[PDB]
């Protein structure tokens, strides 16, 4: 199918090749680096990866019953949930979801807690109209970035996804929603604050025993698991005695930040240039190498290349392909599904979207840049998996996983399933035999932070420490 | 993970709109004994067509006269014409009930739905001369045998020919409709001098039918729901009085005989089908009043409009959307089967997602009340095609007496409109009364089709090549 591509365009495809292609040995280097960075961010020295401990210090077991709600806040929605956990691996979810009014984003920091507030009485009001006997504990998924020094407190260290709000950054958010609550007298405990991968890993933990690990392939990219409290060297003298060194401990690892020293990653002169123009440069380095959001930016930047050195293009107007985050994921994406011999997707897309006209053999040369760029992703990210598991011991594992990657970038879940496979050496035929495989996720932010808030809940009733002495 | 079912309070719907939304459950249930009362119609009706004089259903015999085995084993072309693309298949069946395929697919030029017949046909064998040239590059010993799934309205007097009756889809080429198809194909093959012969025309039906047959040998019936409806089952040759006196000794009275119904005019006399204002406005502005009349009550293409037209109503009667602006929602088909596949999708006690469909599509906003009885009214619409859609299913396996069945259905409805699987075992269950608790065990039941178009006309051209090297006939006497 490349028989009628001219060698030069061929040659300058196997060049590409060169550049996108990660081999299983390479693969198995990046992951030794990537477990040796991951005991780094746990240990007192830190590290560039955070490893940022998720006080969620035991597994949820299946037989967990009761009503527990959580809040979703997304930078446009948020969502309320109410989880009933009927005790065998099973659940029930009642939810509304609500858009946020556009001046909250830019807004003022009371109003929009009291709008968050605003929507927790209207769904407490309907779903239970004659109160409730007990507080109902509730789960927030907060997915900025924030420390925890205990599962119910988060400091917002700096806004992302929209959001612009004077005097959050540097406080603690939880009091901040519970005290609106509070004024509008609704019958809720905030008693955790968590990150959506958190939910991730619990929430499918619950539902499927078999889970290792929750992952996000999205836009964004991160990982959660557990780790155990004597592994986790930046808690030692800091911890009450009743958290003690072989208890398991969620671990949110915030990953996208492995290897911002460049080391290991097999960055392209077209990932420096996406680093260089991006608002933090030299940061979110394996994000930047992973995540779908620049799938579409590496495959224009090597367009925007082929073209200026005189291959492809010839004569057409290439002023939109200059444009910087014009070819989002669905570029990939789209192009990598063509089912047209002669790719007559990856034609409508650039004549109608980039008014570019390509001949049939520069599609080609599309079409094989676009799937060097999805396998490159997909092999990169499974890095993070294996690190992981090689990290903790586990031969064999479900990785349960979310994100608009995973669930709709066509191909992607074989590229990955091959990644390990490629990984690990295992001599298996089928995808669904894999001993680490990837499933999909339950929902993280609605019922894993329910799930969590259970958890939580026990504890505290209990008078157990969820978080550092003090705290 | 699809999300659990949203639970459904109609606890702060007003009394009277909650008189409509009881108003539009009543008017839009389908009964089990009417359900009943329409199988035993369908079936007259289904004996209706295969007789001489015939009736509103077709009832097209497509000359496959044998089940596949599953136990073939061969290469088999398949050219599979749409009215938008084109693929050309090579299947390599396995012959333990397995295949495996490689397509090319094309697009048709827009100057071919408006153009001449040797342009159409040129076109296409130009698209196979591409095919064969990168799959046999050194020639062929014997032609490879293709069966060509051409879906347009024709009659058969023998499997490897097809008179075109009319265009559809838009096809607006002059001097092919009362011409035999095969022949036209077949002479642009030779001009480009591919080894390929022609050896079966089919319906896409027929090919859905035949293909899963050989994967599954429960299979009883293919049917497709999605923008059209059709179904096609093995009756016997004894059976099939507009046959009687034309038929080689040969294919004997005991004979399977593979069936294209075309049911989609089930019932143009309007008696039996439970049809509604909004269906007879349907039918008064379609572009053929009083025509298809089963496929306008099953078809995904309608669901849309339905709830359209009863939003509507419901407007002008002062019930929802009360100081709305109701611009968007007055042009007909402006909403389509994505509509009520969202609405019924959505997992949200307020359901949000209908909220921001019609706010962002339509530019109307909505209460949460006029959400519920949107969600409740894409439910019914949903419930009420896919229950008679199994009236079709009842009709055939009752007819042959199948008292089980896999039901081999494809088609973008059976395929993804939510829930669509459940309302359909659910209605089977409703019209046989099982006494069966898992739907995987429900006696006759739907499952996923193979490929009709593509594997189902590479199996029909194996079955057909070996009657033809026989001597055994495949059409009427003389054909």
């Given at each position: 199918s490349?028989a009628?591509?001219?060698?030069?365009?061929?040659?300058?495809?196997?060049?590409?090749?060169t550049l996108?292609?990660?081999?299983?040995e390479?693969?198995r280097?990046?992951?030794?680096h990537?477990?040796s960075?991951?005991?780094?961010?746990?240990?007192?020295?830190?590290?560039?990866?955070?490893?940022?401990?998720?006080?969620?210090?035991?597994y949820?077991?299946?037989?967990?019953?009761?009503?527990?709600?959580?809040?979703?806040?997304?930078?446009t929605?948020?969502?309320?949930?109410?989880?009933?956990?009927?005790?065998?691996?099973?659940?029930?979810?009642?939810?509304?979801?609500?858009?946020?009014?556009?001046?909250?984003?830019?807004?003022?920091?009371?109003?929009?807690?009291?709008?968050?507030?605003?929507?927790?009485?209207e769904?407490?009001?309907?779903?239970?109209?004659?109160?409730?006997?007990?507080?109902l504990?509730?789960?927030?998924?907060?997915?900025?970035?924030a420390?925890?020094?205990?599962?119910?407190?988060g400091?917002?260290?700096?806004w992302?996804?929209?959001?612009?709000?004077?005097?959050?950054?540097?406080?603690?958010?939880?009091?901040?929603?519970?005290?609106?609550?509070?004024?509008?007298?609704?019958?809720?405990?905030?008693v955790?604050?968590?990150?959506?991968?958190?939910?991730?890993?619990?929430?499918?933990?619950?539902?499927?025993?078999?889970?290792?690990?929750?992952?996000?392939?999205?836009?964004?990219?991160?990982?959660?698991?557990?780790?155990?409290?004597?592994?986790?060297?930046?808690?030692?003298?800091?911890?009450?005695?009743?958290i003690?060194?072989?208890?398991?401990?969620?671990?949110?690892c915030?990953?996208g930040?492995?290897?911002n020293?460049?080391?290991?990653?097999?960055?392209?002169?077209?990932?420096?240039?996406?680093?260089?123009?991006?608002?933090?440069?030299?940061?979110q380095?394996?994000?930047?190498?992973?995540?779908?959001?620049?799938?579409?930016e590496?495959?224009?930047?090597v367009?925007?290349?082929?073209?200026?050195?005189?291959?492809?293009?010839?004569?057409?107007?290439?002023?939109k392909?200059?444009?910087?985050?014009?070819?989002?994921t669905?570029?990939?994406?789209?192009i990598?599904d063509?089912?047209?011999?002669?790719?007559?997707d990856?034609?409508?897309?650039?004549?109608?979207?980039?008014?570019?006209?390509?001949?049939?053999?520069?599609?080609?040369?599309?079409?094989?840049?676009?799937?060097?760029?999805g396998?490159?992703?997909?092999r990169?990210t499974?890095?993070g998996?294996?690190a992981?598991?090689?990290?903790?011991?586990?031969?064999?594992?479900?990785?349960?996983?979310?994100?608009?990657?995973?669930?709709?970038?066509?191909?992607?879940?074989?590229?990955?399933?091959?990644?390990?496979?490629?990984?690990?050496?295992?001599?298996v035929?089928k995808?669904?035999?894999?001993?680490?495989?990837l499933?999909?996720?339950?929902?993280?932010?609605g019922?894993?932070?329910?799930?969590?808030?259970?958890?939580?809940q026990?504890?505290?009733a209990?008078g157990?420490?969820?978080?550092?002495?003090?705290?």
């Open positions: 490349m009628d591509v001219p060698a030069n365009l061929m040659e300058q495809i196997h060049g590409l090749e996108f292609t990660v081999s299983s390479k693969m280097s990046i992951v030794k990537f477990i960075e991951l005991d780094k961010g746990l240990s007192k020295k830190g590290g560039n990866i955070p490893m940022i401990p998720g006080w969620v210090v035991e949820p077991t299946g037989k967990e019953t009761g009503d527990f709600l959580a809040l979703d806040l997304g930078g929605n948020l969502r309320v949930v109410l989880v009933k956990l009927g005790g065998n691996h099973d659940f029930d979810t009642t939810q509304n979801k609500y858009r946020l009014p556009d001046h909250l984003r830019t807004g003022t920091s009371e109003q929009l807690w009291s709008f968050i507030a605003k929507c927790l009485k769904f407490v009001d309907e779903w239970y109209p004659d109160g409730v006997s007990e507080p504990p509730l789960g927030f998924t907060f997915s900025y970035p420390s925890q020094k205990k599962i119910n407190s400091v917002l260290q700096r992302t996804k929209g959001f612009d709000i004077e005097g959050v950054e540097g406080h603690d958010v939880v009091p901040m929603l519970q005290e609106q609550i509070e004024k509008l007298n609704i019958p809720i405990n905030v955790a604050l968590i990150n959506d991968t958190t939910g991730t890993l619990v929430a499918s933990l619950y539902t499927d025993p078999q889970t290792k690990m929750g992952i996000i392939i999205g836009t964004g990219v991160n990982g959660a698991y557990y780790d155990v409290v004597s592994g986790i060297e930046k808690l030692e003298g800091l911890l009450p005695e009743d003690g060194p072989d208890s398991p401990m969620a671990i949110n915030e990953y930040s492995f290897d020293e460049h080391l290991v990653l097999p960055r392209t002169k077209y990932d420096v240039i996406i680093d260089e123009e991006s608002p933090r440069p030299g940061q380095a394996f994000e930047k190498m992973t995540s779908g959001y620049y799938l579409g590496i495959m224009r930047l367009l925007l290349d082929l073209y200026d050195s005189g291959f492809i293009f010839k004569d057409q107007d290439i002023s392909l200059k444009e910087a985050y014009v070819m989002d669905s570029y990939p994406s789209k990598e063509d089912p047209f011999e002669n790719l007559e990856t034609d409508d897309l650039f004549k109608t979207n980039l008014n570019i006209e390509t001949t049939v053999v520069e599609r080609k040369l599309i079409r094989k840049l676009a799937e060097l760029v396998t490159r992703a997909a990169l499974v890095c998996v294996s992981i598991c090689d990290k903790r011991g586990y031969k064999t594992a479900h990785i349960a996983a979310d994100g608009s990657v995973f669930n709709r970038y066509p191909g992607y879940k074989e590229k990955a399933a091959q990644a390990l496979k490629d990984i690990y050496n295992w001599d035929e995808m669904e035999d894999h001993p680490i495989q499933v999909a996720a339950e929902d993280g932010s019922v894993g932070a329910a799930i969590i808030a259970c958890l939580t026990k504890r505290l209990a157990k420490s969820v978080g550092i002495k003090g705290e």
